Amino acid sequence: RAPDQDEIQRLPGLAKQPSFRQYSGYLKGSGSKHLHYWFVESQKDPENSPVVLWLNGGPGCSSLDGLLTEHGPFLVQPDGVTLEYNPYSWNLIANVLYLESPAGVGFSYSDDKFYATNDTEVAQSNFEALQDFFRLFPEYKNNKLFLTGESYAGIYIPTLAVLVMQDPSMNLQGLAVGNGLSSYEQNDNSLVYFAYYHGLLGNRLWSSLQTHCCSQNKCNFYDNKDLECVTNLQEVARIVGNSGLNIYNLYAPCAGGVP
Amino acid sequence: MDPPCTNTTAASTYLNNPYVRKALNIPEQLPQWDMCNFLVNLQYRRLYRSMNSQYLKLLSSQKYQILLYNGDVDMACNFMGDEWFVDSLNQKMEVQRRPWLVKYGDSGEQIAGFVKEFSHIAFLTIKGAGHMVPTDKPLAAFTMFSRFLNKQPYE
Ligand SMILES: Cc1ccccc1[C@H](CC(=O)O)NC(=O)c1cc(OC[C@H](O)C(C)(C)C)n(-c2ccccc2F)n1
Ligand SMILES: *[C@@H]1O[C@H](CO)[C@@H](O[C@@H]2O[C@H](CO)[C@@H](O)[C@H](O)[C@H]2NC(C)=O)[C@H](O)[C@H]1NC(C)=O
Ligand SMILES: *[C@@H]1O[C@H](CO)[C@@H](O[C@@H]2O[C@H](CO)[C@@H](O)[C@H](O)[C@H]2NC(C)=O)[C@H](O)[C@H]1NC(C)=O
């Protein structure tokens, strides 16, 4: 009915024992890949609550960031020892599956230790991992399935959802992507506009961008070959990503200070 | 191992504790836990440049509800790029862009961001949140997540 061997008995750092059952083990991916999962059952009606997969981006970043720092049942404190219960946990209304993916990410691994991969292989390995989850947890097969993710998971989730939609045994109901990479062109063009209107670039750099990168109204900051344009975009990339501004939150400080 | 301007020491110190690894059923022979694997990232071959075809394939069946949510103060994957992306999918049942509300204790109802809805797909902003929406705005993120699961309007 459930893998009793994967069940977390007493998790260190928790002052109170959880009201929900939680599991930590491995899901079989493609080839010799073993993906580490941490599954947190719903705090309210786990048997009927939806099954929600969570994937962090990178590529190469762990989904345990999602659990311990974002929306998990308990969050890690600055001491790196204490865990405090999260009153806004996504597991309050859902059975949340945090999957460290692809192989080599966090506790996930492969027998041959070859971690070179691509979008198509990752989606197929994640699909086989989901199939293994349903083999390990058969009581969750008919539950509403939602595929969720962050950043590069903007590629991970829709590609995985395309494979899941072809499998009628999986009760797919939807997908959610947080600050996701959906299009490189749409992201690159909007960021240059974001940078100027958030006061990171001046009128001199912007006038040069509008004159050289653009034609009347339409701007190309993605694959433009104009000489002054490529020069201006190199400066934009320096201000936005390598000047001391936190790219993940403009109004938050840069951890470790300005280089 | 750590992305710029980020500090992941707290989660790294916790997950690398031998007793935590034992409680999580981690085999002892496995290497140390890192938040982001540099070798996986370096060797990763990016294939797709746009998810346009994937979303249109998912929306064709009309069986799934799709949500794209972005913290509006993030620069890695800014809100505008994803708003442009959702709008470019040109879906039916286009709704007027509206703010979405969250009740904060005794501080009352507040605008948590803005919602742009179409048939089976909605784009949402999370006002004042960065790249990690549930870390920056946990109450707004839970409210949005609950409305998404229950197929309720985001407003
Ligand atoms: C910021 C962060 C913090 C903790 C966990 C995960 C993340 C995010 C992913 C998420 O939001 O789920 N990680 C990244 O945004 C990210 C991007 C990375 O690589 C940079 C790009 O590939 C680039 C060359 C196109 C600029 N990483 C990353 C991965 C492995 C090692 C170092 C890194 F910075 N990490
Ligand atoms: C990076 O994060 C770690 C962990 O949160 C910070 O270290 C903590 O600092 C506080 C205040 O001095 C202590 O109470 C904690 O016990 C420390 N934890 C650990 C695990 O050492 C660290 O200061 C942060 N570094 C930067 C540059 O922001
Ligand atoms: C994405 O990765 C997969 C898996 O590594 C690649 O597919 C394999 O490629 C090798 C070498 O050509 C073959 O021996 C295998 O039979 C392939 N497996 C499958 C399932 O097709 C794939 O070629 C990679 N894609 C790109 C564009 O690099």
From Swiss-Prot, chain A:
Phenotype when changing Y222N: In GSL; small amount of activity
Disulfide bond positions: C213-C229, C214-C219
Carbohydrate-modified residues: N118
Record-annotated active site: S151
Official protein name in the record: Lysosomal protective protein 32 kDa chain
Lineage, broadest ranks: Eukaryota, Metazoa, Chordata, Craniata, Vertebrata
